[PDB]
């Protein structure tokens, strides 16, 4: 349990996933979902992925 | 190789080029009378592109300075930077001129000193067997820089036809019209020569200078000693791909080729943010490149008086964003990532646009290798607002019977006033037609 | 064991100043495992001190950056004296004496443009998927490799850099031609305004793409040389993730296929026809614009080919930059 604390932060990633898939802190997801709605109202296309990585990175 | 001859001319064109050469020695690590530092060749990899090539490691400037007024050159020789200049390339001691304040003075003086004006400036042309071109570092204000500068835009067009022409010309001031009143006449006569007898210009407004000179510089009485500080930095900033070792658009015919849409549409908007010395104490914490180009397209650093509500029906076509020195190039594509999301530049609906970014390492100096610098060379179609400002001040003056009897006594026999008016409206109509 | 004595053989290849090391020949363990670690501390010791010695006094870092700058053109102020003086001479097909006069022109321009240390920077000797050459010249360069620096960069790696400079110089000659279009237009028959738009359209597209295809080699170039210096204990892993820089040179250029090289070479053949058009003096102008829109439709075809690839991290980088060229 001490080698993960020095190198990998294993149980820190247990708390970390709760902020994104379980939506612990809402400001990470509300500033997401505000910027994400002008893309979700249209149907998805082939060109749907390359803007979503950019709208993820300017939301964080 | 890539030798450019600067044509410094006029009362204002000689002073803005005097500190332009004085700026170049502080960044090349050289002295105007000697070589005391070894930083000139290990730090800077190219020096013989604006200077004349060395005979004793003395990089002579490839400069000529003619003016009717002897006051601008008598404030030069007492300064210790005039020994770098040569007293045989342009003039010896006690050079003079006219009386003199007229546009028709220098326009008529060009063909009476026609033998001498095409003799000593052509000796520097055959020094290099591949000449780049000519930059006319002249002025529009007054009759000195506007009268004689219109003559060399014609006779150098055919005697040197395969050379680039492009000027860093300064626009005059339009605040009151008491000291000078001949300002609408001599400006439009040179502005016709700047479009058909000249390929490109670089506009530099005077009413936008004191907008910046009281913005962050904090002066109370505006003097002429501040007009050389904003101008000389962006001149050396424009040749950072050309002086310092760059790869793409490292020539003056490289940069201007990627921005001009068409002839008679060449008026480029300029922007330059960092001018404050107390920013230096907080650039130690890795100030990035992601925040320096968000404010270039934002109309704050502009040197062009234009309308604020006229940018919705106008569209950018070409925009240049030059970063210098420390760039951290692993995030320079990250800065260009954020451009499409804001759409701060209106794009032309008929064709593609382009946001070109480039970098070059700066001088080995502590205020240069620490603080980020951003040079903008925009091209926006709201530039007709200045052309609407100059034309509305031109036709209003001809109905007041101003300088129609006081101007046509010498070398003017026919009315060439509407020859300038229609050609200016040709520029103003083809700009709005260009976005279909 | 074998790859220690391999590294005890390359210390011999630089001289005897490192042969017979000072330690090791002091200690000996023979119980259980612990002599297999004597092989591992063998494996790093004589191999790291050789890396310091070439970093010190044979200048490996200075040699790897100079091969880098010669086959990727990071410093182009040399090349408006180099490439401009070669294209004046390579425009016709070479007889037999032209590469002798090209290296005569090379060191002329090397010291007019005043490189860093000219007796150290004159190592350029001019040489003149399954790919073949698609240009009109075999013009490239050759660096002076000398063992035991043949281990860090190989002669097989020199040919990989030699093919890498050839694909950079092909599109670079288009811009040299395209800058000659801009200087010859400066003064047509009846189509002057239509020629002005396609000069700006063609030049700005190539000035975009070749500012890019230089640069996306460069931002992993400083990425790898930071992680070259950070994790250097043996020489074996360090050489392998230095070949990951070579694998990064692979992902910049090998993604283009032989069909894409036929499309980019159509840009060269339309520039020589349009330069001939301006010096001779509308139907050819409309033929050039249809030649451009065929290229713009071919670029959309490569956009669909790059979307249907193996869907790896290299797929994402090439599909982002060609959506990026499509947004231009």
Written overview of the protein:
The PDB classes it as cell cycle. The structure is cut from a larger assembly and holds chains A (60 residues), B (436 residues) and C (328 residues). With 60 residues, chain A is mainly alpha-helical. Chain A has four helices and no strands. Helices cover 29% and strands 12% of the residues of chain B. In chain B, strands 2-1-3-4-5-6-9-7-8 form a nine-stranded mixed β-sheet. In chain B, helix 1 (13-28) crosses helix 9 (229-238), helix 7 (183-193) packs across helix 15 and helix 14 (384-398) packs antiparallel against helix 15. Chain C has twelve helices and two strands. Chain C has a two-stranded antiparallel ribbon. Classes of the chains: A mainly alpha (60), B alpha/beta (436), C mainly alpha (328).
Summarize this structure briefly.
Chain A: It is found in: Cytoplasm, Cytoskeleton, Microtubule organizing center, Centrosome. This is part of a larger assembly, with chains A (about 60 residues), B (about 425 residues) and C (about 325 residues). Chain A is mainly alpha-helical and about 60 residues long.
Protein topology:
This is part of a larger assembly, with chains A (60 residues), B (436 residues) and C (328 residues).
Chain A: H1 2-7, H2 10-17, H3 27-40, H4 49-57
Chain B: E1 3-9, H1 13-28, H2 39-42, E2 63-66, H3 71-74, H4 103-109, H5 114-117, E3 131-135, H6 144-159, E4 164-168, H7 183-193, E5 200-202, H8 209-213, H9 229-238, H10 240-243, H11 252-255, E6 267-272, E7 316-324, H12 332-337, H13 339-342, E8 354-360, E9 373-380, H14 384-398, H15 417-433
Parallel strand pairs in B: 1-2, 1-3, 3-4, 4-5, 5-6, 7-8
Antiparallel strand pairs in B: 6-9, 7-9
Helix pairs in contact in B: 1-9, 4-6, 6-7, 7-15, 14-15
Chain C: H1 2-5, H2 7-10, H3 36-58, H4 60-72, H5 79-87, H6 98-112, E1 125-127, E2 140-142, H7 155-185, H8 192-230, H9 236-253, H10 258-280, H11 283-307, H12 313-326
Q: Kindly report the spatial arrangement of strands forming the biggest sheet of chain C.
A: 1-2
The helix count of chain A comes to 4
Please tell me what the overall shape of chain A is. Answer: elongated
Strand content of chain C: under 5%
PDB class: cell cycle
Keywords: gamma-Tubulin Ring Complex, microtubule nucleation, cell cycle
Entry title: Structure of the vertebrate gamma-Tubulin Ring Complex
Chain A: Gamma-tubulin complex component 3 homolog
